[PDB]
Design a protein around this ligand. Structure first.
Ligand SMILES: Nc1ncnc2c1ncn2[C@@H]1O[C@H](COP(=O)(O)OP(=O)(O)NP(=O)(O)O)[C@@H](O)[C@H]1O
Ligand SMILES: Nc1ncnc2c1ncn2[C@@H]1O[C@H](COP(=O)(O)OP(=O)(O)NP(=O)(O)O)[C@@H](O)[C@H]1O
Ligand SMILES: [Mg+2]
Ligand SMILES: [Mg+2]
Ligand SMILES: [Mg+2]
Lengths: 593, 593, 102
């Protein structure tokens, strides 16, 4: 009778005793700002923090999930170029500019960066407010929000001191957010910094293996042999990411694959990318400038329409463009209008040859003092002595006509982008790791590790052929199976119908609407063929080649999107002691007066 | 001209670069709740935190300063006794009580503790709001407020499980404060816990040496010899603290002072009290129950008025009370009324023999099963078989008369309190360290380290004699110089005048008003004489004996008050890694749902 | 009794050496150090962190560390360093640079 009565009070103390002894889980928000070539966008993540008595607070790596990738705001290159347009004078690209004199315009650069940072801050708060509940908002606001803004190919080739000075200003803007929203955003020079091409690739590798459950320190994903060495239970997969201005080729070295002295591989533990508790791997990570969608599109048109084999009487014959397609002779943004016509935007900012022509200037110290970089520009038809407009201009050319020959398109993508005579401009990082071009990657370094392809158009190249039944539903990544399917697709005629321009497939296979995204997809199809040709040429061949947008989580729903974002989080969060000191001990409270 | 213009922008970046690289100082509040015998009070402290990149956040020990000691609320003993009065029935002290049955009244104990905790919380917030400015309030609220509630002699002798169960409830009440005030109070079982008598003494030693700038790890306060051992530049000082229910005797062992096997000394580094970077010391720390002001006052009246040498026909002659002074025969609170009369409060709660009579009960397992503890009670005139009222009652006594003989008062304080035949009840901790009584301390362990005396009445004993010109302004602590001065003062007559009772000093020396604080000061004067007699009897004698209330800081203004408060803070804050994990990594955020 | 840590670092001699050869030699060199003559009593030992080919930047950086250490410009003690009011350690004397022509 009273035995059960005294047990309630006994349980009351046990419950209270458990609360103090047990660990407590709280929700924390993490922000990664992708300051890429094309745009500057926020990526809001959510992770589960665990605080234990005498053990401090840590993040569960498996709990890291993307809630939303924000709006695409102005790129860091545009911000700095606008500042130079107003504080170093208009058309500074064709004139010699004194960098020392620009130091008096640093407070003016702060205002330009403030405008962009206020947009990114407003967008981040809008995402958090829409996805988090009141209980979730309290935990998120109390812990603070670590912000990691990393620049990529956009400002990677940026001349002088300007880029680094902007980063000092960007960090102050993050560390000083609006107190009205309640979200405590904070940063440091270790989180917010320009990331290298190898780092961009390495983080993308960490993201892929984490999400696909290949990389882990637990017994479910790893195994300790009789000599105390931790090995992963499943083979670590490599990645191929194609952005706006650069492409990354990342793969781990399986077994005792001996490499030349010139070729530099990165051991994840030795180079402090992953903790010692994680299984070790020697990874080849290389990034190629002028290989991303936007930059490669501009460079291809410049080199192809400069060759006497393709340019005749002002008419440049493009094998990567469909039969009947017609456009003006310039690297500017192409808009496929409803009447079948191609509207080419002649604005300098919207021109796809601009970042390359701005780098290839005799007024840039990387050209005037380094003859090697000048010859790299001249071989890609850009004269650094000539003014900006003359550099982006395809000389003696009026109209680009589409021939639709896939084999000729592959042959040209190969000689221009994949395997050129001299390396593509602004690729000193790639050359220092021992790779002057894409063909040299698989020639000097090869792996039996499965590869994953990432990039909007890279996926679109495969999906379009799969949709028209040219490629099998199950596609392992056969080189000649792809080349046969794309050859039949690229030879297709363009018929301007009442509905608009339609891609008419030969032998009455099928049809699809022509737009600003698929008009030049044959260049990317040829790029995929050439890339897979070198992978199949290498001493070691991947087990399988997969094309993925995002990795599906354990519940079926995808946890996060593929890229360097999750990788940069894990690079900091996995170092338990170091993360606790910067994110929790110092925190947003460090910013206080 | 433009050289100075570009330098402004150069300085703009340098200032911003310094902000991210440098350390940032923020203000943090620290709370120590003294849950003593007499009362439960808050102590609000302020410290300067320093967060450095890759170094985390730490507290500057020298920046720790007391802002205010709060109001004196109900003691933990009263809270638990009131709970037993209502849930185990009234007069539970004289009846056998089943502890198992009290487990059904745990939620009821929570309400009793909630009432006290809400008062302490309200008082703490009132102190913070009155002393901190708006800028200071923000830094204090953002970092969180570590709370350290430690129980002393009040519940040290508390029977059964009740005390420990209360502490589990107390921590939940701290961890759940009012969100309205904004102050983020939090605790853990390492901060909020009952502290031992040795710990109470050891922390009081750490406070004294920290404030007086004797204890430090820097070259200003310490020195490294040719064998890599850190020694303090100045001699570490010992302390004698006299509270309400217990007295602590603490002193470090200088040189290779060899001690007996039974005598247990505590090495500050080995017992994890101070970090390894601090200079090491072997410290003798002992606490004696029934030696504090309130408890010793009750015990003395019980033992003196039970001796046939002092009790005749219901009139107890007290040598520690002035000539002409008259009071009722009971240990209850004495109020000196304006008409010269002594009002003795006969309420059980207000009676000074209550904690001793409650411990000395045949129904308490420490008496019924342990014969040694029963004989300790019987020798101090308390019969554990008799009811509570009969235990506190001074049998065959009606009125206490003051004889004013100082030499007879010293002789009685010695045989009763200082050197009794059997140890004073509830002193198992003292006996386990090798000290059954006060006389045994200096007999077995002695040091040439300077001693510091602490306690309201202990200081008052010296100051009163200094004021009447009986003792020199400069007083080193001479035993017979004190005994001569006090002998002339204690022999003083009490004259009931129109203004009230006045202490008339012999040979027309001077006069002072008699009140509830100085009527029995001669017992404390005799206690100081007896204490200094044993210090002078020991093999090693202190360099100097000083009487201090608080230690003056470097600016002249005192940083904090003497006691175990600053010592308990330094015991946690000085362990850089451990403090950062519990106070900053886990923090108040640990309490979140 | 304590053992003798061995650090074999190659400079410009094999820096430009073609193919695998150099790196394969370093795996063999470490095994030869880790297996010395027991007759002499000197306990020589190495690891891939100590014995390895050093880069040109590393060769220069170590030469900078040597110069500043020996000339008493580099140090963590109060005699050679100073902590400002913002908790940052600065060296009391200016750190000197080096030009080494091998
Ligand atoms: N909203 C979009 N989402 C995904 N891809 C897009 C989007 N808009 C354009 N693209 C295409 O994808 C490319 C940019 O891909 P993206 O992942 O943003 O890399 P990036 O950050 O701009 N380049 P990098 O500096 O090398 O990291 C463009 O050149 C387009 O072909
Ligand atoms: N407001 C007060 N401030 C200082 N001393 C006081 C005060 N009120 C009473 N006292 C005297 O000081 C004694 C209590 O001193 P105190 O420092 O509070 O120790 P305590 O915490 O009650 N005892 P303990 O449990 O052994 O730590 C009383 O017995 C009085 O003689
Ligand atoms: Mg990118
Ligand atoms: Mg006390
Ligand atoms: Mg040399």
């Amino acid at each position: 009778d009273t035995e059960k009565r005294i047990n309630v009070g006994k349980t009351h103390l046990q419950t209270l005793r458990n609360l103090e002894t047990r660990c407590h889980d709280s929700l924390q928000a993490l922000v990664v700002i992708d300051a890429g070539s094309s745009s500057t966008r926020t990526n809001v993540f959510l992770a589960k923090t665990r605080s234990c008595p005498n053990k401090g607070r840590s993040i569960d790596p498996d709990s890291i999930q993307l809630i939303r990738e924000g709006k695409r705001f102005t790129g860091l290159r545009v911000v700095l170029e606008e500042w130079l347009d107003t504080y170093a004078g208009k058309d500074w690209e064709s004139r010699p500019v004194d960098a020392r004199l620009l130091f008096q315009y640093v407070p003016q650069m702060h205002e330009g960066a403030k405008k962009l940072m206020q947009l990114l801050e407003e967008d981040t708060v809008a995402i958090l407010d829409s996805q988090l509940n009141e209980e979730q908002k309290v935990q998120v606001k109390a812990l603070g929000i670590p912000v990691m803004l990393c620049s990529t190919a956009g400002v990677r080739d940026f001349h002088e001191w300007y880029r680094d000075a902007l980063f000092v200003l960007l960090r102050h803007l993050i560390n000083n957010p609006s107190p009205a929203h309640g979200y405590k955003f904070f940063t440091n020079p270790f989180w917010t910094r320009p990331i290298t091409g190898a780092e961009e690739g390495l983080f993308a590798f960490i993201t892929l293996n984490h999400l696909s459950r290949r990389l882990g320190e637990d017994p479910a994903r790893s195994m300790i042999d009789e000599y105390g060495v931790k090995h992963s239970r499943n083979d670590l997969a490599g990645v191929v990411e194609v952005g706006g201005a650069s492409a990354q080729i990342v793969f781990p070295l399986q077994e005792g694959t001996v490499l030349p002295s010139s070729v530099r591989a990165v051991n994840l533990q030795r180079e402090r990318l992953l903790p010692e508790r994680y299984p070790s791997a020697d990874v080849v990570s290389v990034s190629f400038m002028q290989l991303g969608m936007a930059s490669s599109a501009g460079l291809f048109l410049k080199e192809l329409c400069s060759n006497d084999e393709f340019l005749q009487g002002g008419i440049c014959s493009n094998p990567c463009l469909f039969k009947g397609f017609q456009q003006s002779c310039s690297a500017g943004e192409v808009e496929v209008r409803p009447d079948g016509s191609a509207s080419v935007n002649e604005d300098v900012r919207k021109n796809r040859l601009k970042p390359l022509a701005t780098y290839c200037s005799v007024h840039n110290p990387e050209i005037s003092f380094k003859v090697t970089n000048e010859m790299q520009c001249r071989e890609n038809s850009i004269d650094p002595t000539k003014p900006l407009a003359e550099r982006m201009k395809i000389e003696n050319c009026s109209i680009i006509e589409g021939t639709g020959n896939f084999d000729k398109c592959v042959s040209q993508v190969e000689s221009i982008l994949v395997a050129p005579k001299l390396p593509l401009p602004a690729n000193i990082e790639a050359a220092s790791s021992g790779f002057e071009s894409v063909d040299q990657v698989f020639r000097f370094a090869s792996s039996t590790a499965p590869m994953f392809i990432t990039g909007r158009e890279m996926l679109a190249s495969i999906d379009t052929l799969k949709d028209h039944r040219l490629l099998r539903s199950d596609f392992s990544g056969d080189v000649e199976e792809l080349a046969e399917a794309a050859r039949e697709f690229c030879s297709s005629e363009v018929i301007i119908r009442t509905d608009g321009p339609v891609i008419q497939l030969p032998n009455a296979r099928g049809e699809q609407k022509l737009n600003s995204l698929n008009f030049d997809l044959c260049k990317t199809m040829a790029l995929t063929v050439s890339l897979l040709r070198h992978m199949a040429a290498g001493e070691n061949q991947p087990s399988f080649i997969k094309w993925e947008k995002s990795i599906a989580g354990p519940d079926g729903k995808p946890l996060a999107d593929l890229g360097w974002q999750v990788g940069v989080i894990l690079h900091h969060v996995l170092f338990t002691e170091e993360w606790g000191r910067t994110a929790y001990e110092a925190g947003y409270s460090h910013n206080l007066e």
